């Protein structure tokens, strides 16, 4: 399971 991979602002 992955960490927070959402793109940064």
């Amino acid at each position: 399971s992955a960490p927070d991979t959402r793109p940064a602002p």
């Epitope: 960490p3 927070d4 991979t5 959402r6 793109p7 940064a8 602002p9």
Partner: antibody
Framework: QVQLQESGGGLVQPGGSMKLSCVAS????????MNWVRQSPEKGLEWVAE??????????HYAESVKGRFTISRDDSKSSVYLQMNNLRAEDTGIYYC????????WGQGTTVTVSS | IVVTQESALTTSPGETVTLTCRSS?????????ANWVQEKPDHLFTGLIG???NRAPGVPARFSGSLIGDKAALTITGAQTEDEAIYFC?????????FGGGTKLTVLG
């Protein structure tokens, strides 16, 4: 401009309890997970806790050394993340930072927590 | 789990340096989502790389993350004097992170 700003650090005796606060600004705090990471002389950087998004039910994970004594939580209404520390030990002494975004791009200035009898 | 980095490295400005980061459990892979964090004098921390090779926003193009052999690595191409600082790497193990000891970087200024 993004800014993370911790708060609530202080001196405490073993057995003590305190709550740290971190307020984020300059970006959509609600969109990212937040973590607490502490810096101590004897230990360098040590990850302490993470908290995910509202849509993750505010799910959390903790380092084994902190499990059962620390609790991370967030309030997106306030753009803030927090760390409630209980049953503090001298080994918990250190500078505590909230940090997040891909996966530690942002770090606050840190708040010192000293646990000493 | 123990994450190991080089204690210190020295470089003249304009040269390239690579710092590595190993895991005591085995090879570092993309699943460890290796991060690289920079500490400048006064406890100023800033993330450089996340997810192995994704450079954080605003971070200079001269910084690159990668995987070399069984380790994660940070490469600074054409290092500048402003890069003298300490560099930490952090590795993800399914549901927790372990940070390395930090590498002090000197860029002879």
């Amino acid at each position: 401009q993004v800014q993370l700003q911790e708060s609530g650090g202080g001196l405490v005796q073993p057995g003590g309890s305190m709550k740290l606060s971190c307020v984020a600004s300059g970006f959509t705090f609600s969109n990212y997970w937040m973590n607490w990471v502490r810096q101590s002389p004897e230990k360098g950087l040590e990850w302490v806790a993470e908290i995910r998004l509202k849509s993750n039910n505010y799910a959390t994970h903790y380092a084994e050394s902190v499990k059962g004594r620390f609790t991370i939580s967030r309030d997106d209404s306030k753009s803030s993340v927090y760390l409630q520390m209980n049953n503090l030990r001298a080994e918990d002494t250190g500078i505590y930072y909230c940090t997040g975004v891909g996966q530690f791009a942002y770090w606050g200035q840190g708040t010192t927590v000293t646990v000493s009898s | 789990i123990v994450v190991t980095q080089e204690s210190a490295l020295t470089t003249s400005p304009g040269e390239t340096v690579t710092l590595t980061c190993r895991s005591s459990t085995g090879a570092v892979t993309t699943s460890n989502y290796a991060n690289w964090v920079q500490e400048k004098p006064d406890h100023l921390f800033t993330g450089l790389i996340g997810g192995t090779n994704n450079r954080a926003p605003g971070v200079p193009a001269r910084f690159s993350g990668s995987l070399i052999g069984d380790k994660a690595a940070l490469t600074i191409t054409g290092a500048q004097t402003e890069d003298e600082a300490i560099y930490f790497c952090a590795l993800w193990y399914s549901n927790h992170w372990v940070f390395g000891g930090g590498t002090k970087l000197t860029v002879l200024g």
